Amino acid sequence: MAKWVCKICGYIYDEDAGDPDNGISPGTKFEELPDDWVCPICGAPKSEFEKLED
Template identity: 65%
Template sequence: MEKWQCTICGYIYDPSVGDPSQGISPGTPFDKLPDNWVCPECGATKDMFEKI
């Protein structure tokens, strides 16, 4: 699965890990994250992420 990086703080969303801090299960691809999901490090919105 593709990883995505926050262009503000550099946080990398890894689908194999998910985001336990926001209840996102491992295996959740970036495009399936809720629209209101934000970067757990800096609070940036999904549109501030780039595929890496």
């Protein structure tokens, strides 16, 4: 699946890993994350992530 980078801190949201410490099971697409999910490192909102692909 895809990877998305936080443009603030460099955290990479990996859809294969999810974010299970914050309620997100592995295999959850970025578009499926709750509207109030934020970067687990810096707190940036979803708007500040970019998909890693051309």
